Amino acid sequence: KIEEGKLVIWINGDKGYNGLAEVGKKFEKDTGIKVTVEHPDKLEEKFPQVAATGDGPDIIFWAHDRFGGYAQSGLLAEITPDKAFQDKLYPFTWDAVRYNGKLIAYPIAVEALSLIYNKDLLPNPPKTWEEIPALDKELKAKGKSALMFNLQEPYFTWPLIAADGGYAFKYEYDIKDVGVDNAGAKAGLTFLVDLIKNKHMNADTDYSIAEAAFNKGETAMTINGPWAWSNIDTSKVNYGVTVLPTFKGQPSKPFVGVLSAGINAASPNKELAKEFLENYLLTDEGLEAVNKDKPLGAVALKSYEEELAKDPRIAATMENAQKGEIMPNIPQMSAFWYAVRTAVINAASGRQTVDAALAAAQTNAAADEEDDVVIIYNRVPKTASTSFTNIAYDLCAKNRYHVLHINTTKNNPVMSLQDQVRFVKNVTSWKEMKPGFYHGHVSYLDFAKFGVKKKPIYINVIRDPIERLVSYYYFLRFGDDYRPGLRRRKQGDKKTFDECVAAGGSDCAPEKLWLQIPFFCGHSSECWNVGSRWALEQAKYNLINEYFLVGVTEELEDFIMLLEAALPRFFRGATELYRTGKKSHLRKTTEKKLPTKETIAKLQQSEIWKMENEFYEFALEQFQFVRAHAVREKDGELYILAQNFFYEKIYPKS
Amino acid sequence: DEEDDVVIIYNRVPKTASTSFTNIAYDLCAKNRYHVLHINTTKNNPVMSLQDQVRFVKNVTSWKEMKPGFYHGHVSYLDFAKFGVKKKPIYINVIRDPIERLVSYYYFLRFGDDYRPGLRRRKQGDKKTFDECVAAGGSDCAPEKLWLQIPFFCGHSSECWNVGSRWALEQAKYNLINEYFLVGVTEELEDFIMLLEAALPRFFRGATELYRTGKKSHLRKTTEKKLPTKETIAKLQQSEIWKMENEFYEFALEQFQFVRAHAVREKDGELYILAQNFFYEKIYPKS
Amino acid sequence: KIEEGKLVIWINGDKGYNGLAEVGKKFEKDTGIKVTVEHPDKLEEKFPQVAATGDGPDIIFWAHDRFGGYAQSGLLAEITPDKAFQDKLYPFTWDAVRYNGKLIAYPIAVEALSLIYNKDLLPNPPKTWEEIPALDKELKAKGKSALMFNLQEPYFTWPLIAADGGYAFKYEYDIKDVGVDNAGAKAGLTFLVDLIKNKHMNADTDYSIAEAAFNKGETAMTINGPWAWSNIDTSKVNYGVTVLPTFKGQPSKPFVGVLSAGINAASPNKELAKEFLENYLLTDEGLEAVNKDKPLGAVALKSYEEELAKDPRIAATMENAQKGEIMPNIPQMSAFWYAVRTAVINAASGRQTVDAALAAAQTNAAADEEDDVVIIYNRVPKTASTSFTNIAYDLCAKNRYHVLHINTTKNNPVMSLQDQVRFVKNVTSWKEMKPGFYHGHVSYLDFAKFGVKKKPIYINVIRDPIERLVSYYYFLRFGDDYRPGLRRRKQGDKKTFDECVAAGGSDCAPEKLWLQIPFFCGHSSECWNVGSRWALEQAKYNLINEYFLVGVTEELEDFIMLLEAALPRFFRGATELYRTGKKSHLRKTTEKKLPTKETIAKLQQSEIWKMENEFYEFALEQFQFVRAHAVREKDGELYILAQNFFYEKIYPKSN
Ligand SMILES: CC(=O)N[C@H]1[C@@H](O[C@H]2[C@H](O)[C@@H](O)[C@H](O[C@H]3[C@H](O)[C@@H](NS(=O)(=O)O)[C@@H](O[C@H]4[C@H](O)[C@@H](O)[C@H](O[C@H]5[C@H](O)[C@@H](NS(=O)(=O)O)[C@@H](O[C@H]6[C@H](O)[C@@H](O)[C@H](Oc7ccc([N+](=O)[O-])cc7)O[C@@H]6C(=O)O)O[C@@H]5CO)O[C@H]4C(=O)O)O[C@@H]3CO)O[C@@H]2C(=O)O)O[C@H](CO)[C@@H](O[C@@H]2O[C@H](C(=O)O)[C@@H](O)[C@H](O)[C@H]2O)[C@@H]1O
Ligand SMILES: CC(=O)N[C@H]1[C@@H](O[C@H]2[C@H](O)[C@@H](O)[C@H](O[C@H]3[C@H](O)[C@@H](NS(=O)(=O)O)[C@@H](O[C@H]4[C@H](O)[C@@H](O)[C@H](O[C@H]5[C@H](O)[C@@H](NS(=O)(=O)O)[C@@H](O[C@H]6[C@H](O)[C@@H](O)[C@H](Oc7ccc([N+](=O)[O-])cc7)O[C@@H]6C(=O)O)O[C@@H]5CO)O[C@H]4C(=O)O)O[C@@H]3CO)O[C@@H]2C(=O)O)O[C@H](CO)[C@@H](O[C@@H]2O[C@H](C(=O)O)[C@@H](O)[C@H](O)[C@H]2O)[C@@H]1O
Ligand SMILES: Nc1ncnc2c1ncn2[C@@H]1O[C@H](COP(=O)(O)O)[C@@H](OP(=O)(O)O)[C@H]1O
Ligand SMILES: Nc1ncnc2c1ncn2[C@@H]1O[C@H](COP(=O)(O)O)[C@@H](OP(=O)(O)O)[C@H]1O
Ligand SMILES: Nc1ncnc2c1ncn2[C@@H]1O[C@H](COP(=O)(O)O)[C@@H](OP(=O)(O)O)[C@H]1O
Ligand SMILES: OC[C@H]1O[C@H](O[C@H]2[C@H](O)[C@@H](O)[C@@H](O)O[C@@H]2CO)[C@H](O)[C@@H](O)[C@@H]1O
Ligand SMILES: OC[C@H]1O[C@H](O[C@H]2[C@H](O)[C@@H](O)[C@@H](O)O[C@@H]2CO)[C@H](O)[C@@H](O)[C@@H]1O
């Protein structure tokens, strides 16, 4: 849906979008590519929201803290600037946009909150936060106010919270150790609430109210960033940009954002976007053109920053920037800001107490039990399991999960009751392996019987009974190409499969077709009773009732595509890895001889075959139905369907 | 504290008095302190995509501010076990005689109802009566159209929607017994409500009183209905699709009757709910 | 996964692991067995994680307080030192590692926290805790500090908490009446928080910060154990090891740990481990070799302790040791330390108030973690149930669980919907009966429908349909020998079973064979429809899908043997009790007359029998399969199989 041959750019409303559009017309005049710059409402959390119905922009502009969640969702393309370009930008800004080892955005400028005071109304600004209730007294009698800023966003509130000792995820890597309810956090927020209790400030004060109250000279001070400097100049109000006040003798620690430009992973114009950012924007001409509209702060470009650093206002921004901390780009930051936004608004409107509001936001920040998942792939031999499992291995590091292989003595697929109990205990209570992907040639094991809290997710892949047996036959004879060093068990057997069947051999007897059924039937006796009608039926019921998804070998690509859509925690990027990996067809059996029409015909006379086949076509028909209902075929490739349900008539209201 | 972590799912079957029952939940939810949400699916398709299944399950179980909750909607039975949740929801349902339900649904699309008489229904402007349609071998009254209540219990498996499937029938019965907390029948809706008030009083405290004295007990009557000829019903009953859809009904019915028979006492006039009939003894160690 | 023919040993990081490795090289030189000594991070938490998977070290070194949870989880092997060895170690240290009557670890040394002060910076150390805020004043002006120790671990914090009257589990046998929120506990902790409020100490002070601040002579005092003495000697800082200060005139009561070595239950080298500990470590040569790396404190070996007791520092350690208390080895100690660790850190960072933090930790110490299990034995009449159940009754006291019997009106096996809901609610939310063993003649009830968190574990025992009917026949007529006082229902009926069948009697009609199927089929209508094909099939599906194990009467001994191996919490010692108990064949029907070949032949013509029998043989063939895969027949008897799986190729790696 993103138009090719043009660039669409989304940048925040309060920034210099008119200035960026100037650089857009210089790119259009030079390359012929139309550049459209827009500033949609609420793009902090609603960039992939409304993009679930329509694919849009090529370049996205925001602070680097969001760009990690975008990256993990696969919404960004890994940018590739040459080292000649990386050396003209501050190395620390590149770290701000480095997620999982690779770069995901082009760092533009470094923004930070500073204290802005009215030179006329207040010659000497307060050094501390405590001398503001006393300062508001005299200004209230005149008809003014001591301070006015955005209380609806936790961005402006955080410097006071992190002042005395508040923090979010301690930087050791960062852990799930949130400190929004410690001494410093509670003390900082409580003082802010007492400023509204004593009516030194209004709890409904947003951005527009704050900006208007200052530019019209109704309030002495305000808190904002570089982007609000241009709007004060048009008011002729003499102001000054200084260092943030100190709470409890502690310097305020504002969160430092780095304005970054990332490239949409869906954008077809990734080459036009790369050229625009590197050659037209991230240059002295481009940055100055945007700076004329709304100040960017301290740019990441070495060249243009040497000239901006000679500014009394930029000096104050980089001062507060060093007092504060650069935000993490971890995906938890999206849930962090939401949690704090809620705690701040509630504490300010009296709808909740400071002690309780921060205690609630304490646990909304991380540890949402999204990490407590376990997949079991009880892989069936010679069904392309090696190729699939290696996707799990390649993604586990990046997608943050663990992959373990289960080994059983003499490869026996049935566990002893005591071993079943231990396995179940392990899978479920081995916290340090969650989320986890256990795999191995084990028969289906039912966790319900053992009274666990949470069952694991079962998936599998099966193959045509005869083609699997034949593949397995020649496998023991000749081995594979994944590990060609192992000498297989029945190596040194010359007879071919077709020759064996005709000779009534034991390795190619129909009874040897019975495997995929017991693998689903489980550790019950009747499952391994070869040719059991009960075993068949039970194997079907388990595949329907207990297996999350079971695909077929010969359609493994679609199987992986569906898992990436359903369980993206485990399989984000699995499809791309499969299509462009060279590790997609692992463990080919070295020397295979496909069976004669005559050989296949004789196997098909066996009831053991008729059943093992019936199960296959059952599991196949099922997969084909699952896919059919999950995708849409829009000329060529399949595309995963959007969300097709919603909730309505929700009472009581509210 | 209180047991607030409960979620009921009523995957309502079309034209089975579901509007009447659901409005009880709506009337009591405020007073009994719970939430009632309606599930809407694109084009009314009762089967969710795998990715939508995961989302729905995730919501139901982890949407804390809607607990306890009563989700309802025309969705085929969805098994939460597969997705490895901590706590399964409680499934309840109400089914109706296969033929009487189809006929009711037939005239519904033709003429609409009285609950929302403003909506123009999909096949409105079709004059043919049900009986005439069957005799003319119409599409809307083909025996294949009887197949609905079975898949609604069978679920999101392929074989469920394979019309006339013997496997689908068997699975549908197994689900009704193993997964559904209680499934009652339309024509005995009062008793179904009475049992729910006794079993799940958090949701249905005062539901029976509300039903008996409410004037909101018979909602969404199909405006113009013509009951089928003995001849029309007789021809439908020749179809295996009917024989199966009926077999399932009588199965579910026989079950409900059994459940009720063991929960109530028939003493001179009205049924009375049975007291507690078990206790614990020989409890060691002492302490 | 544990390699055979070598020893792997895990010991804590702050201990003398390089010294132990010296003893490893002397064992390798002598026996040829390679010994590898490692010191993993979070060792106390890592061991049970790893050892559960059937992996880990052969020998594990920690204080004895953890070793009970390890034992109950079956992660330790019962050690067997001869009396000749037990008599060269202090008898009280053997009590420190005695859990459930048996020994589970080899006690090494007795460690206890003492006060360490800088001789130069402070000639006369304070005897009370209160004269520290006053002492920190003068040292702050000089550029020093009064005290610096680990606040991140409740081990160092506990002496101040237990000082005025704080405690954990009162000793009656230990009770589960926790006192981490009483007067002494709150008073002790509040004073600690006031030391951070008044900025006499930092709330982020861990172990490394504490040790560095003292060894560099930046702080006057510190709190630690014997293992930290070696690191101060390398700083040339003149120190002294004295008795812990007194809070509110009460001597500080530090928790006393006993460094113990236990043998991994999964280790194949249990004989090599036993020889290493007894002959190479727990000897004067071995302990001295470790002691020279990091001091052990007061060793448990009588021989080497007589020489260490002549030490000014060891004298102070054994002083504080007697002031304090030896930690319990109960499994609850793992949940206790967690609860206190949380309360302390929160109170210290202002994240929570002392009153509130200890009140929260008060109820976290009784954490029913692995104790949340419930078995339901819905016993079938006349199937040796009384005999089996009495094993549960005899073990429940000792194995720490509860046994409840379920009684139903007129012994009707089907519950009303409202009763089903109540029963399910009880079973799952009746916390004071967990773990529990509910039993009674109730039909199978499916807990899944009701949306519970955790399902109970279902087990059962069935009997041959005809033999059960006959037994139940004569039972109503003549009664049993377990309770011979009860006058049975149909007592005073003379007709024998064989004569009844021939006469087409009501009590021996084929319809009466239908019982074991509905009991598994459940509370659904079709189950009690006699002769139902659907009921049969469902009964089979329930036995496979829902029942943890169903055994048969005539092989009850093996059923019990498997349960002891699978659910040892409930049935540890059940097999021994059965074989040597005289309470193994309870409730024999007084007067029985076995059926004629003619009588049995007529019953077998009935479809009701053919089905009820088909179910039996199904359940039987299943049990035989379960046993077959769980045991090994090594001449005559049966022996439970070892662990036969393991995890490998575990990515991502650490590292
Ligand atoms: C310890 C260590 O440090 N290790 C190093 C090292 O890591 C290696 C491991 O050492 C190595 O074990 C492991 O192998 C894995 C393998 O990678 C894995 N691949 S998978 O994930 O893609 O699946 C997996 O491979 C399996 C296959 O999945 C199975 O299909 C296959 O089963 C076969 C079986 O082989 C057949 N047997 S055969 O005929 O003898 O060949 C056959 O089954 C037989 C069965 O064997 C018989 O027992 C049975 O016998 C009877 C008898 C009687 C009887 N009757 O009477 O009826 C019937 C049967 O018969 C059956 C049969 O006939 O079927 O068929 C099976 C299939 O059906 O087995 C495997 C296979 O490929 O052959 O599992 C194996 C393990 O099993 O790999 C790792 C690895 O990481 O590559 O090297 C790495 C370096 O790469 C080190 O890692 C580094 O560590 C560093 C560190 O120190 O931290 C770190 O810094 C580095 O970053 C890191 O890379 C690692 O440390
Ligand atoms: C957004 C808004 O405006 N919100 C306002 C508003 O609230 C409204 C909602 O707007 C409104 O949507 C909702 O309606 C509910 C309804 O109330 C509910 N009733 S129930 O609880 O008793 O059940 C429920 O009704 C359902 C029935 O349950 C269903 O049976 C029924 O399904 C029918 C379907 O309609 C048929 N379609 S038709 O023929 O086209 O008519 C048919 O299904 C069709 C399907 O539709 C077709 O698409 C499909 O097509 C094909 C084509 C081909 C093909 N093939 O080839 O094979 C197959 C199929 O075919 C199928 C089919 O033929 O089967 O039959 C179905 C039955 O089988 O649908 C509904 C019905 O009654 O028609 O759900 C609906 C929603 O769906 O009601 C609320 C409400 O509260 O009343 O207004 C309220 C005020 O009244 C506002 O509330 C206020 O909010 C304020 C605020 O917060 O801002 C607050 O301040 C105020 O206090 C508060 O009051 C609210 O904001
Ligand atoms: N992406 C893929 N699609 C279809 N078959 C695949 C595949 N990757 C591997 N295979 C096949 O799967 C078999 C290996 O199975 P497994 O990995 O479970 O041991 C081999 O079969 P062949 O013997 O026909 O070569 C291999 O060729
Ligand atoms: N309390 C009740 N008992 C029996 N049938 C009822 C009922 N309340 C509503 N119905 C019927 O149920 C149908 C409506 O179903 P639903 O509410 O699911 O859409 C209508 O059927 P008819 O078409 O026969 O009139 C309506 O008459
Ligand atoms: N260890 C054991 N092995 C086999 N049967 C036993 C047994 N202990 C008791 N029984 C038998 O079990 C029946 C009692 O069942 P229950 O305890 O459930 O009421 C009696 O059967 P008989 O009637 O043949 O004597 C009793 O003999
Ligand atoms: O307040 C939550 C919000 O804070 C930050 O957003 C800032 C942004 O960094 C600035 O560039 C400017 O737009 O002000 C915003 C706040 O109004 C975080 O960047 C963002 O993730 C978070 O939602
Ligand atoms: O602090 C919790 C912790 O306390 C004890 O651990 C001690 C251990 O006994 C000492 O040998 C040394 O290692 O210091 C440890 C604390 O850092 C308990 O033994 C242990 O169970 C508990 O977790």
Secondary structure (DSSP) of A548-607: EEEEEGGGHHHHHHHHHHH-HHHHTTHHHHHHT-S-SS----SS--PPPHHHHHHHTTSH
CB distance C566–A423 less than 8 Å?
A: no
Question: Phi-psi category of C249—alpha, beta or left, where left has phi over 0 and alpha has psi -120 to 50?
Answer: left
Looking up tokens 């070793």, which residue turns up? C67
B118 has a chain C CB within 8 A of its CB: no
**Which structure tokens are listed for C413?**
């096996």
Q: How far is CA A488 from CA A474, A478, A485, A594, in A?
A: 10, 7, 9, 20
Indicate whether residue B186 lines ligand 4 (CB < 6 A). Answer: yes
Residues A348 and A436 in one domain: no
The verdict on whether residue B62 carries a ligand-binding annotation is: no
- The reply to whether C642 touches chain A by the CB within 8 Å rule is no
Contacts of A403 in chain C (CB under 8 A): 649-651
Q: If you measure from the C-alpha of residue B108 to the centroid of ligand 4, how many angstroms do you get, rounded to a whole number?
A: 11
Residue C458: closest CA among chain A residues belongs to which residue?
A: A449
Backbone angles phi, psi at B286, to 5 degrees: -100, 165
Give the span between the Cα atoms of C280 and C285, in whole angstroms: 8
Tokens linked to C628: 């077959």
Sheet of strand A221-224, all strands in order from the earlier edge strand to the far edge: A221-224, A114-118, A239-242
For residue A143, the number of C-alpha atoms closer than 13 Å in the C-beta half-sphere is 2
Chain C 45-74, residues with CB within 8 Å of chain A CB atoms: 49, 52-54
DSSP conformation class of C276? I
Element (DSSP H or E) covering residue A336:
helix A333-348
Residue entry with tokens 């598994």: C520
> Which DSSP state fits C167?
B
Instruction: Region of A598 please: left (phi>0), alpha (psi -120 to 50) or beta.
Output: alpha
Q: Structural domain of residue A215, as residue ranges?
A: 114-255+333-364
Query: CA A380, A382, A384 angle in degrees (round to 5)?
Result: 90
How far apart are the C-alpha atoms of C56 and A426, rounded to whole Å? 14
Q: Rounded to whole angstroms, how far apart are CA atoms A338 and A69?
A: 14
Q: Name the token pair of C600.
A: 């049995």
Burial label, C84 (beta-carbon count in 10 A; 0-12, 13-18, 19+):
exposed
Residues A360 and A434 in one domain: no
By C-alpha distance, which of C565, C590, C571, C547 is closest to C640? C565
Query: Which residues, including other chains, have CB under 8 Å from residue A311's CB and lie 6 or more apart?
Result: none
The rounded distance, in Å, linking the Cα atoms of A104 and A108 is 13
CA-proximal residue: ligand 6, atom 17 (nearest): A153
| Spatial separation of the C-alpha atoms in residues A563 and A558, rounded to whole Å | 9
**Phi-psi group of A73: left, alpha or beta (phi > 0 → left; psi -120 to 50 → alpha; rest → beta):** alpha
Identify how many contiguous H helices and E strands chain B contains and give both numbers. Answer: 11, 8
CATH number at residue C242: 3.40.190.10
Distances (CA, A) of A277 to A37, A264, B275, C439, C583: 14, 13, 77, 74, 86
Length of chain C: 655
- Ligand with smallest separation from the Cα of B72: 2
∠ CA A561-A565-A571, nearest 5°, is 75
Closest of C139, C112, C295, C157 to residue C221, by C-alpha: C139
**Ligand 7 atom 6, closest CA:** C155
CATH of the domain at A571: 3.40.50.300
Could you tell me if C105 and C276 are in contact, meaning their C-beta atoms sit under 8 angstroms apart? no
Q: Which residues contact B275 (CB under 8 A, 6 or more apart)?
A: none
* Strand spans (E) along A227-308: 239-242, 246-247, 250-251, 255-263, 298-299
CA C618, CA C615: separation in Å to the nearest integer?
5
Q: Name chain A contacts of B47, Cβ cutoff 8 Å.
A: 629
Q: Write phi, then psi, for A436 (nearest 5 degrees).
A: -135, 155
Query: Half-sphere exposure (CA, 13 Å, Cβ side) for C551?
Result: 17
As a dihedral over the C-alpha atoms of residue B136, residue B140, residue B145, residue B151, rounded to 10 degrees, the angle is 170
Q: How large is the C-alpha radius of gyration of chain B?
A: 20
Residue pair B37/B172 in contact by the 8 Å Cβ criterion = no
**Angle, CA of A212, A215 and A216, to the nearest 5°:** 80
Residues 6+ apart with CB under 8 A from B207: B24, B28, B193, B196, B197
Tally of domains within chain B: 1
If you ran DSSP here, which 8-state letter would residue A2 be given? P
Active-site residue, A441 included: yes
Residues A597 and A618 in one domain: yes
HEC letters along B256-271: HHHHHHCCEEEECCEE
Q: C444 to chain A nearest CA, in Å?
A: 14
Residue B157 to residue C581: CA distance in whole angstroms: 54
- CB contact at 8 A, C150 and C14: no
* A433 and A529 both lie in a single domain: yes
Q: Which residues of B touch C524 (CB under 8 A)?
A: 177, 255, 258
* CA proximity to A177, closest of A306, A324, A363, A301: A363
On the question of a cis peptide bond just before residue A268, with omega within 30 degrees of 0, the verdict is: no
Neighbours of chain A (3+ CB pairs under 8 A): B, C
Which residue of A540, A630, A652 is in closest CB contact with B51? Answer: A630
Instruction: Record the tokens describing residue C638, joined without a space.
Output: 């049966």
What would the two tokens of residue A349 be?
Answer: 């409107």
**What secondary structure letter does DSSP report for A327?**
P
Ligand 1 atom 63 nearest Cα: A489
Within 10 A of C617 (CB to CB), how many other CB atoms are there?
A: 11
CA-based R_g, chain A, Å: 32
The residue of chain A nearest to residue B30, with distances taken between CA atoms, is A652
Of the candidates C546, C630, C651, the beta carbon closest to that of A418 is on C630
Distance CA A639, CA C41 (A): 47
Minimal Cα–Cα distance from A619 to chain B, Å?
9
Task: Say yes or no: A360 and A483 in one domain.
Answer: no
Burial annotation C241-259 (CB, 10 A radius, 16+ → b, else e) = bbbbbbbeebbbbbbbbbb
**Element (H or E) spanning C625, and its range?**
helix C607-630
> Does one domain contain both C342 and C386?
no
d(CA A439, CA A445): 12
**How far is CA C308 from each of CA C91, C260, C311, C421, rounded to the nearest angstrom?**
18, 19, 6, 65
C442, C379 Cβ separation under 8 angstroms: no
C465 lines ligand 7 (CB under 6 A): no
Per DSSP, C9 falls in state E
Token representation of residue C357: 């933090």
Q: Which of A629, A638, A646 is most worth mutating to test chain B (most B CB atoms within 10 A of its CB)?
A: A629
- Residue A643 token pair: 């969300």
Q: In whole angstroms, give the CA distance from residue A580 to residue A577.
A: 5
- Residue holding tokens 């189950």? C527
CA pair distance C112, C297, nearest whole angstrom: 8
Write phi, then psi, for C97 (nearest 5 degrees): -120, 25
Q: What size, in residues, is chain A?
A: 654
Q: Which residues pair with C96 in a beta bridge?
A: none
In DSSP notation, A20-31 reads HHHHHHHHHHHH
Residues forming beta bridges with residue C406, ordered by sequence position: B280
Residues C340 and C486 in one domain: no
Ligand nearest, relative to CA of residue C463: 5
**A639 half-sphere exposure, CB direction, 13 A CA radius:** 9
List C-alpha distances in Å: C82 to B258, C58, C101, C141, C278: 66, 21, 16, 61, 10
Q: Do C451 and B88 make contact, defined as CB atoms within 8 angstroms?
A: yes
* Adjacent-strand bridge partners of B264: B273
N-term to C-term CA, chain C? 19
**Tally of residues, chain B:** 287
Contact state of C396 with B285 under an 8 Å Cβ cutoff:
yes
Contact call for residues C19 and C291 (beta carbons, < 8 A): yes
Rounded to the nearest 10 degrees, what angle do helices C333-348 and C183-197 cross at?
A: 40
Conformation bin of residue C36: beta by default, left when phi > 0, alpha when psi is -120 to 50: beta
Q: Does A196 touch chain B (CB under 8 A)?
A: no
Q: Which residues contact C383 (CB under 8 A, 6 or more apart)?
A: C461, C462, C463, C468, C553
Claim to verify: residue A549 and residue A597 sit in the same structural domain: yes
CA distance C307 to chain A (A): 44
Alpha-carbon distance A242 to A222, whole Å?
11
Asked if C625 lies within 8 A of A524 by C-beta distance, the reply is yes
DSSP conformation class of A487 = P
| Residue numbers of C annotated as active site | 439, 441
Using CB atoms and an 8 Å cut-off, which of residues 409-428 of chain A contact chain C? Answer: 409, 412, 414-419, 421-423, 425-426
| C470/C604 same-domain check | yes
The H or E element containing residue C436 is strand C436-439
Going C456 to C459 to C465 to C469, the CA torsion angle's sign is negative
Tell whether C402 lies on the interface with B, counting CB pairs under 8 A.
yes
Say how far apart CA A198 and CA A191 lie, in whole Å.
10
C310 touches chain A (CB under 8 A): no
Helix (H) or strand (E) run with residue C262 in it: strand C255-264
One domain, residues A360 and A378 = no
Cβ–Cβ under 8 Å, residues C560 and C461:
no
Same domain, C489 and C635: yes
In angstroms, the first-to-last Cα distance of chain B is: 26
Of the candidates C536, C514, C505, which has an alpha carbon nearest to the alpha carbon of residue C465? C514
Classify A301 as helix, strand or coil: strand
Q: Is the separation of the CB atoms in C325 and C253 below 8 Å?
A: yes
Instruction: Give dist(CA C254, CA A470) in Å, integer.
Output: 70
Judge: C451–B274 Cβ closer than 8 Å, yes or no: no
Give Cβ neighbours of residue C30 (< 8 Å, ≥ 6 apart): C280
Nearest to B140 by CA among B76, B47, B44, B236: B236
**Rounded Cα–Cα distance for residues B71 and A598 (Å):** 57
Residue of A39, A439, A585, A629 with catalytic role:
A439
